[PDB]
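Q: I have four molecules that I believe assemble together. Could you output structure tokens for the complex as a whole instead of separate predictions?
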Amino acid sequence: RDLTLLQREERLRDLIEKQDEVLTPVVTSKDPFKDNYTTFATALDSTRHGNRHRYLEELQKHLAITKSLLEEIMPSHASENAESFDTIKDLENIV
Amino acid sequence: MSNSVEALLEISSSLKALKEECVDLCSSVTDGDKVIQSLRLALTDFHQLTIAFNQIYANEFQMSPMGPFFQFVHQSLSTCFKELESIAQFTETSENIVDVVRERHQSKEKWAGSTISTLCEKMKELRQSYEAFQQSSLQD
Amino acid sequence: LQMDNVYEAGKVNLITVVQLLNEALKLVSGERSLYDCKGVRLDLQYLHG
Amino acid sequence: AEINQKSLELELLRLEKETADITHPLYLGQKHQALQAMNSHLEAVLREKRSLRQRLAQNLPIEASYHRFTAELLPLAVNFIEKLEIYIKTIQTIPKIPDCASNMDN
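A: Yes, here they are, computed for all four components at once.
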């Protein structure tokens, strides 16, 4: 009984030691990451609702207007309305 | 003797109860050593990526930057298209249905015999006839 | 509206197209403000029912 | 002798249950998966750092993850412009939509 229990405890210790070595660095850097990532994601979410470089810069200026106009024109249920089209057509055929 | 036998029955019952609780633990000996190695790699990567992100977040967030503008405009414009088409279809369908039903109520056809009538009139006539037949049978 | 030609040297000017798109969207914005102030909702559940 | 054997077995099983969350392959496997998903996500974010920066601040050298959106934008814009009048009429019909729904119901 004593030999059998000792063999099992040794195996458990080996396994815990291998895990501690790799988990310790990740837990220490967690809080700064979570906070930086959340602030980043919230900032990104607020934006959704000649020389070739020079060209892409001019294009960006106009696409920015486009993005602003689309955010203004689009109703809150626009996506739901867009899904109703097939259902409307089915009703007509049944009648 | 009587005490030993009672001790066996108690321990046997305790073992049976614990084996049932540990059903998920009893499956296939996959090489525990392999899973740990894999976990080690994933954690190590995760740690490296978190650091890399924090570094970029502090320096740049806190290749042309044009990719996200294209995606947004594309998806928003597409949704706008589909929405307007749906509104138009609803109006058309509603009007078509009103016409089909109106035509059915007003259309005159030779249904039975020599007389032309609407479907509603002929149906009423037929109903009256069987009401009359039933009344003549209850007075019997 | 300082807009270049839609087609320059026989090729499509993407910037002009986007500019036209912006004007089109303004028109659409104006019309939606007049006729769809509250945003029209097609009750999908009603239609399915 | 029989009691002693079963007692040992019980003791062993109890030890295994108490340490399963950190030791058993099943539970360790689940933790691996969750970690791999996040890694992949972060890799993507790092790959699109420039575009994301430009958005926050607001051949053609565009990041490969966005080639599709860029290529398809032209046709989409053309189509919208061409159907502009139809979209305007449609928008004008929006106040009639409740009447249309009532007549149909009748």
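A: One point stands out. DSSP finds four helices and two strands in chain B.
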